[PDB]
Amino acid sequence: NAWEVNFDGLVGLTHHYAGLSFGNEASTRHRFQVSNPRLAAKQGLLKMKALADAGFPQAVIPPHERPFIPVLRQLGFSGSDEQVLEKVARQAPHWLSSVSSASPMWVANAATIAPSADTLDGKVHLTVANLNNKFHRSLEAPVTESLLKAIFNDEEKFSVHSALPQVALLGDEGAANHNRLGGHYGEPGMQLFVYGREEGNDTRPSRYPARQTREASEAVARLNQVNPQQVIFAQQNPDVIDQGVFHNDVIAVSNRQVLFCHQQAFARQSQLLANLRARVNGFMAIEVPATQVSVSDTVSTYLFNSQLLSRDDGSMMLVLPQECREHAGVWGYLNELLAADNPISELKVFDLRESMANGGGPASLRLRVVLTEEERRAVNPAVMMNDTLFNALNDWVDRYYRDRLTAADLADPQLLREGREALDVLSQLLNLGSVYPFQR
Amino acid sequence: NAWEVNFDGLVGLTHHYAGLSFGNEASTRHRFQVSNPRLAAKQGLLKMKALADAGFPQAVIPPHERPFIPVLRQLGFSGSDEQVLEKVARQAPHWLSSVSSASPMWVANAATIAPSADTLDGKVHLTVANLNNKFHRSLEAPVTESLLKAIFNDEEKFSVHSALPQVALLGDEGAANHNRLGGHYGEPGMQLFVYGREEGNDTRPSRYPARQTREASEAVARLNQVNPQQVIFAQQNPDVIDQGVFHNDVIAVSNRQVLFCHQQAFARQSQLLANLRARVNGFMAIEVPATQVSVSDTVSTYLFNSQLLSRDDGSMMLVLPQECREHAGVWGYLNELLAADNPISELKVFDLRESMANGGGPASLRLRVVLTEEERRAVNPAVMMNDTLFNALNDWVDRYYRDRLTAADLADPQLLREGREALDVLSQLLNLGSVYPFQR
Ligand SMILES: N=C(N)NCCC[C@H](NC(=O)CCC(=O)O)C(=O)O
Ligand SMILES: N=C(N)NCCC[C@H](NC(=O)CCC(=O)O)C(=O)O
Ligand SMILES: [K+]
Ligand SMILES: [K+]
Known part of the structure; x- marks a missing residue:
């Protein structure tokens, strides 16, 4: 008898728009707009708090070290942190952005989860996603692993695995391409891994990249010790990826027996839904026809990057981003x-x-972790959402986050200091210890 | 007053043909033929010994740990070494080949070298290549770094840098895409970095991959502290890459004031040669027209993957692979x-x-390192080629190498043991200590 716990990413203070994700139309369209870090974090915390107060288990995952100087050094720039910051700013300012993204906020890509009810050894497994397709995102893995091990520290109940090798052949985007269908969260479930491409398969996007590979998905399934009879692999419809659906969570979402998805979500969709219907009792596929909502409208409103929550009476709630209400059709x-x-x-x-x-809706900001009562208790209590943490996190944000930020500001040695201090204090608040590289 | 020292790769015991390198036509054409590891190693040692006896400074770089079980575990296969070997063999035998390749033998891709005469701090710099394009090759970096640090151990004379981040954006194939033109090896030289593609540039191969990116090349130039006025970046002709030239040393090679290359080697070749002529005193470009030797024949014979050596009197010798003599035209x-x-x-x-x-000729098996008398002396003496090492290495090969091998054999637990022991013995022979992962 377990519950699904939502872990949301606390937006980092270097949140900005750099158009780093080709294939992510929102990211590309908002290229250099001014960002509001403070507001970004605030918006996220309100959603977290709201769902929490509504009775849906909620937790937080902290932002990362940004700007990340270590990688700039790895790229050949030397000197003190400020000196590297300066050199890069004047010699290769584009790298500055690459190591200063608040992208880890989208924890849906943090890892892939396997509830103890589906694993061979009966433990909760979490495999960090390499996020190899996008350079700025591929830097997250190491720190994300440190953070997940700091939160799910009871090694007798949780098993955190390191990310797959960093190569295109094993591109992995985590939970964002994962799905779980079944009865009650606590019972063994059916895991559906969606991928964009696979070796030897000519079926693949031709305009935007397929970040997830079947090879990666299969390796994660192994790493997470998922019972072989509770796993299914399906290929995303290449055509929909070429229209902006860079993660499955931008065109489909699952919850309990329901699979809410667009009609053009998968290749061989009919076979997959039939397979799910036969393998998952009570399976209900809610398909949206292109006739009622175009893929174009799907990508701009993010009606599918919504959270499908279970109410105590079995009914469900759809958590949607404001643009879903601002679009008459959707x-x-x-x-x-x-x-x-x-x-x-x-x-x-x-x-x-x-x-x-930047291409992230309600679901992109959360990582679903089904935990039993005993496992829930083994989670670092300091990251569970409640009044105290909410007020503390808001105060923390008001103390260190700026109201405005631009790529140009990423060179400000002052921003670097504020961030280091902010994270130091945060690590104490969340009882994580010296989890960030700069603290070691 | 320095000498160019050739460091060749000692072919590993798992040498086999798996067709893992798309873009490398030799690799693809010899897909599953039977291999002869013992013979492979012997052939290479003969070339080493011959050049050594001819008076050309020669050294060796040992093979890697193969099969590499750690990576298989990282891919989700657990149990004892032999258990993982078994599971993988039966569940995903293709991975077995990816972690059992003797590819590190091609040390021309091991790293990028910067002789002390071209660096800002006056030291010899070596930056390990990530070899990110090919998964089987991308596994080399870590051990390659350990080996380079075990050979070039005098930190006051050598600076070994870690590989660039593992992402397509920074694909780096090392020295195979590097060139150095100038007078005597010991004088400051002009380094020419050849790359296949760069962001924002529409000019790039459309059939075979461009493994090297300008972004990477620029970063290595920084890492190696190469004097800015001694660096030039040039793009490989995309058309020639789409014909099998996956590395620049398959279409051009430099030495002293000479740049021996095919007419279709680079994009804007005329401007590059004019640039070199103006910036490199005595520069001599020896261009081979398509009329005399086709690109097709260039890729099959490897006339350009030859070693261009300087004889005591300034004249030069061309070290070529047998197929150059077996081809009437070439x-x-x-x-x-x-x-x-x-x-x-x-x-x-x-x-x-x-x-x-497998797509490697004379040059692919060697890494050119220009060293001063004092730097030469700081190199691990145990790896310098001579009668003692030659006889010892041949006996070592006779003791552990098989006369035949196939992908099917890579699952043999016996092969794994032979390899581990062979490496342990070699580590002692070459005085490298516990340099391999399995020894730690
Ligand atoms: N749907 C899920 N699960 N995640 C969405 C993450 C969006 C993110 N955008 C960015 O990282 C853009 C950064 C910039 O351009 O500033 C990405 O492309 O990976
Ligand atoms: N010219 C230089 N410097 N190096 C050539 C290396 C060949 C190597 N072959 C391979 O890795 C193929 C192995 C196989 O398929 O079994 C490669 O493709 O990278
Ligand atoms: K309803
Ligand atoms: K001649």
Whole structure:
């Protein structure tokens, strides 16, 4: 008898728009706009707090060390931190952005989770995602591993595995391409791993990259010791990737017996839904036809990067980003879905404009971890969301986050200091110890 | 007053043909043929010994730990070494080959070298190549770094840098894409970094991959502290890459004031040669027209993956692979070049069939390191080629290397043991200590 616990990423203070993710249309379209770090973190914390107060287990995962000077050094720039910062700013300012992204905030890509009810050894397994496709994102893995081990520290209940080798052949984007269908969270579930490409397969996107490879997905399934009979691999529809769906969570989401997805989500969709129907009792596929919502509208509103939550009476709630309400067509469809006879009996909207401008909605900011009562108790209590942490995190944000930020500001030695201090204090607040590289 | 010292790779015991390198036509064409590890090693040692006896400073770099079980475990396969070996063999035998390749033998891709005469701090710099394009090759970096630090141990004379981050954006293939033109080895030289692609540049191969990126090349130049006025970056002709030239040393080679290269080697070749002529005193470009030798014949014979050595009297010798003599056209051209009035006054041919079948000729098996008398003296004496080491290495090969091997054999637990013991013995022979992962 376990519960699904949502772990959201606390937006970092270097949050900015750099258009680093080709294939992520929001990122590319918001290229150099001014960002609001303070506001970004605030928006995220409100969603966290809201869901928490609504009775949905909520926790937080802290931001990373940014700017990340170690990697700049690795790239040949030497001297003291400030000196490297200076040199890079004047010689290769584009790298500055690459090592100063608040991207780890999208914890949906942090790792892939395997609830103890689906593993061979009966433990909760978490495999860090290499995020190799995007350089700025590939830097997250090491620190993310340190953070996950600092939060899920009971090694008798949790097994954190290191990321797969950093090569395109094993591109892994984590939970964002993962799905879990079944009855109650606590019972053994059916894991659906979605991938973009595989060796020897000519079926693959031709305009935008397929960040996830089947080879990676299969390795993670092994690493997480997922029972072979509870795993299924499906290929994302290449056509929809070429339109902006860089992660499965941008065109489909699962929860309990329901798989809410667009009609053009997968290749051989009919075979997959039939397979799920036969392998998952009570399976309900809610397909949205291109007729009611175009893939284009899907990518801009992020109706599928929503959180599908279970209410105590079995009914479900759809957590959506504000742009879903601001789009007549999609909002109209969501309400039709709401009124229709199905599990979706409530719509909840949040303003996550800062995150959405970089291609991340409600789901992208959270990592679902199904935990038993005993496992829930073994999680670092300091990261569980509640009044105390909420007020503390908001005060922390007001003390260190700026209201405005631009790539140009990333060179400011002052920003570097504020960030180091902010993280130092945060590590104490969250009882993580010296988890960041700069603290060692 | 320094000398160029050639460091060759001692072929490993797991040498086999797996067709793992798309873009490397030899590798692809010899896909699953049976290999002869013992012979492979012997062929290479003969070339080493011959050049050594001819008066050309020669050294050796040992093979790596193969099969590399740690990576298989990182891929989700658990249990004892033999258990992992078994599971992988039966579940994903293709991985077995990826972690059992003797690829590190091609040390021309081991790192990028910067002789003390070209560095800002006056030291010899070596930056390990990430070899990120090919998974099987990308595994080399860590051990390669350990080996280079065990050979070039005098930290006051040598600076070994770690490989660039492992992402396509920074694909680095080392010295194979490097060149150095100037007067005497000991004088400051002009380094020419050849790359296949760069961000924002539409000019790039469309069939085969461009393993080297300008971004990487620029970073290595920084890492190696190369004087800015002694550096030039040039792009490989994308058309020639799409024909099998996956490394610059498959289409061009430099030595002293000479740059021996095919006419279609670089993009904007005329401007590059004019640039070199103006910046390098006595510069001599020896261009081979498509009319005399086709790109196709260039890739099959490897006339350009030859070693261009300087004889005591300033004249030069061309070390070529057997296939250059077995090809009427190329052989005819080499002799014409030999008879023509130029530095090339001698042709030397070696049988490197085992290495050639996987796309590597004379140059691919060696890493050129220009060292001063004092730096030469600081190199681990145990790896310098001479009668003692030659006889010892041959006996070592006779004791541990098989006469035949196939991908199927890579699962043999006996192969794994032979390899571990062979390496342990070699570490002692070469006085390298516990340099391999399995020894720690
Ligand atoms: N849907 C999920 N699970 N995650 C969305 C993350 C968006 C992120 N954008 C960025 O990293 C853009 C950064 C910039 O351009 O500033 C990405 O492309 O990986
Ligand atoms: N010219 C230089 N400097 N190096 C050539 C190395 C050949 C190597 N072959 C391989 O890795 C193929 C192994 C196989 O497929 O079994 C490569 O492709 O990178
Ligand atoms: K409903
Ligand atoms: K000649």
